[PDB]
Amino acid sequence: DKATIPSESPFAAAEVADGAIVVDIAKMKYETPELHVKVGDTVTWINREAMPHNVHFVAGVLGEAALKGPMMKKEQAYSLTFTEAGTYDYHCTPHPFMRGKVVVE
Shortest CB 52 distance to Cu ion, Å: 7
Shortest CB 48 distance to Cu ion, Å: 12
Note the maximum CA span of the chain: 33
Shortest CB 92 distance to Cu ion, Å: 3
| Among residues 48, 56, 95, 101, the one that binds Cu ion under rule CB under 5 A | 95
How far the first Cα of the chain sits from its last, in Å, is: 17
Asked if 80 and 38 touch (Cβ cutoff 8 Å), the reply is: no
| Among residues 3, 45, 47, 53, the one that binds Cu ion under rule CB under 5 A | 53
91 belongs to the binding site for Cu ion (CB under 5 A): no
For 15-29, the DSSP string reads GSPTT-EEEEEETTE
As annotated, the binding site for Cu cation includes: 53, 92, 95, 98
